[PDB]
Amino acid sequence: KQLIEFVRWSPERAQHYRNKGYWIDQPLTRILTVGVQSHPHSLAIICGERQLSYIELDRLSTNLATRLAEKGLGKGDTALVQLPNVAEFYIVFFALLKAGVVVLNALYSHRQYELNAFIKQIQPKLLIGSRQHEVFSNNQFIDSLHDVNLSPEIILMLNHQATDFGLLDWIETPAETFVDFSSTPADEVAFFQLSGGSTGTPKLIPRTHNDYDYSVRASAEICGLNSNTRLLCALPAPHNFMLSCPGALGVLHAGGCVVMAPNPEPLNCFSIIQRHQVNMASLVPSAVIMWLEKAAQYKDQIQSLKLLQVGGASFPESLARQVPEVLNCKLQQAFGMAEGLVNYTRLDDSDEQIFTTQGRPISSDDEIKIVDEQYREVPEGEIGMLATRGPYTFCGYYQSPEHNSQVFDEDNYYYSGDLVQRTPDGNLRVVGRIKD
Numbered sequence: 158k159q160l161i162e163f164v165r166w167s168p169e170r171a172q173h174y175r176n177k178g179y180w181i182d183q184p185l186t187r188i189l190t191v192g193v194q195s196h197p198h199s200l201a202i203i204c205g206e207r208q209l210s211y212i213e214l215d216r217l218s219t220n221l222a223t224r225l226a227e228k229g230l231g232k233g234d235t236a237l238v239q240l241p242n243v244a245e246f247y248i249v250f251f252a253l254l255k256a257g258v259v260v261l262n263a264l265y266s267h268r269q270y271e272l273n274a275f276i277k278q279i280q281p282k283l284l285i286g287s288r289q290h291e292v293f294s295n296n297q298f299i300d301s302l303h304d305v306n307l308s309p310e311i312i313l314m315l316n317h318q319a320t321d322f323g324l325l326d327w328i329e330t331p332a333e334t335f336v337d338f339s340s341t342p343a344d345e346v347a348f349f350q351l352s353g354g355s356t357g358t359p360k361l362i363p364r365t366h367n368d369y370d371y372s373v374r375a376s377a378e379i380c381g382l383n384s385n386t387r388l389l390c391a392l393p394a395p396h397n398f399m400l401s402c403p404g405a406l407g408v409l410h411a412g413g414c415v416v417m418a419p420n421p422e423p424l425n426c427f428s429i430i431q432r433h434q435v436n437m438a439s440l441v442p443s444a445v446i447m448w449l450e451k452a453a454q455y456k457d458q459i460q461s462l463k464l465l466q467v468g469g470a471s472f473p474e475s476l477a478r479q480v481p482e483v484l485n486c487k488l489q490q491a492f493g494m495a496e497g498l499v500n501y502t503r504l505d506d507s508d509e510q511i512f513t514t515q516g517r518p519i520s521s522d523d524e525i526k527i528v529d530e531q532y533r534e535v536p537e538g539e540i541g542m543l544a545t546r547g548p549y550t551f552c553g554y555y556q557s558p559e560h561n562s563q564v565f566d567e568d569n570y571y572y573s574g575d576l577v578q579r580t581p582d583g584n585l586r587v588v589g590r591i592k593d
């Protein structure tokens with residue numbers, strides 16, 4: 158009956174963020190509902206040989222949601238989802254959003270140790286995974302959960318066994334009986350993001366419908382998405398970068414289409430780009446290097462790429478400059494964190510800004526301090542530690558009061574651990590990382 162706990166913005170900041178129109182108090186399912194009303198038959202997801210329209214995505218994820226409701230899963234409960242880069246990922250995401258189940262999307266690369274830690278932390282009543290994943294290849298991990306009194310009530314499996322509940326069976330058909338359901342309230346937790354770079358297993362980041370939808374809408378505007386955007390989803394779909402910056406959710410917000418790839422391997426990605434005339438992609442620097450190494454051979458297959466976002470690791474200027482020369486598309490640098498703040502070079506920034514900086518915040522109410530070791534603001538342009546708060550930056554990790562008191566200051570700035578300097582033009586350069 159209690160909704161998932163999380164650390165709230167002050168009411169004065171919530172009001173401000175509503176007054177500015179950042180927080181519009183709609184569930185994240187707004188993206189689907191609006192697109193179904195506007196363009197039900199536009200393609201939402203391309204996955205392998207499948208073409209999911211907006212109304213198909215909407216009907217498939219309602220089916221799953223009615224099935225879960227039928228089982229007493231709803232507001233107050235949590236789910237652990239671990240799916241590869243396939244359409245069912247988003248069907249499941251929107252299904253849990255619709256049903257009011259707070260979902261943690263594990264990376265498909267996470268193994269038993271991480272999944273165990275997540276299950277201990279959110280005690281999910283629903284687990285959704287794939288039988289082709291190493292961890293669910295046998296029944297050992299699911300069995301270990303009974304021992305520890307953490308068995309979920311429902312396990313749905315992709316590529317399922319005859320014994321299992323088939324995830325695709327619960328998507329294909331709605332429940333036999335009607336049980337009511339609804340999203341969690343727009344200013345309550347919608348789902349858990351995961352931190353990057355924390356010491357042990359990733360820390361849980363509660364995200365509300367209000368703040369995630371804002372970052373998605375605002376990112377989609379900055380990146381200039383529209384209904385002809387076709388975005389390659391080659392990075393892990395659950396990752397903040399791939400999901401909201403502007404990510405699949407931004408593309409759906411804009412009425413475009415997400416094109417799935419299993420991973421960023423260049424030859425296969427290039428084939429998907431050519432086949433579906435992908436015009437946007439998002440990559441981390443190591444994946445850009447791989448593409449850069451094949452792109453001359455395949456210039457023709459990737460001509461349609463119009464925009465490449467790059468972020469997630471340091472991206473030297475020498476490499477940035479190769480993106481337009483070799484990939485024949487525009488560069489946008491992105492520096493963000495699942496905890497909130499996202500920076501983009503703008504599409505009309507100068508070439509030097511795009512090649513040498515990681516841009517500037519989504520929001521004019523993204524507040525930045527760049528501080529020395531005495532936590533005093535450095536002189537303009539020097540390197541300091543980044544601290545930030547704003548309308549989509551979280552206010553604390555899930556159930557971690559001790560850690561939270563260490564990375565938030567008294568004004569509720571979050572200390573991301575990133576080292577940065579502000580350039581004269583107003584943009585940020587990420588130059589490193591600092592501990593504790």
Ligand SMILES: O=C(O)c1ccc(F)cc1O
Nearest residue numbers: 397402468491493494495
């Ligand atoms: O987590 C990251 O490293 C990351 C990178 C770019 C972006 F736009 C958002 C992000 O969360």
Ligand SMILES: [Ca+2]
Nearest residue numbers: 178179374375
């Ligand atoms: Ca907005």
Ligand SMILES: [Ca+2]
Nearest residue numbers: 352353354494
């Ligand atoms: Ca981080």
Ligand SMILES: [Ca+2]
Nearest residue numbers: 460461462485
């Ligand atoms: Ca191009």
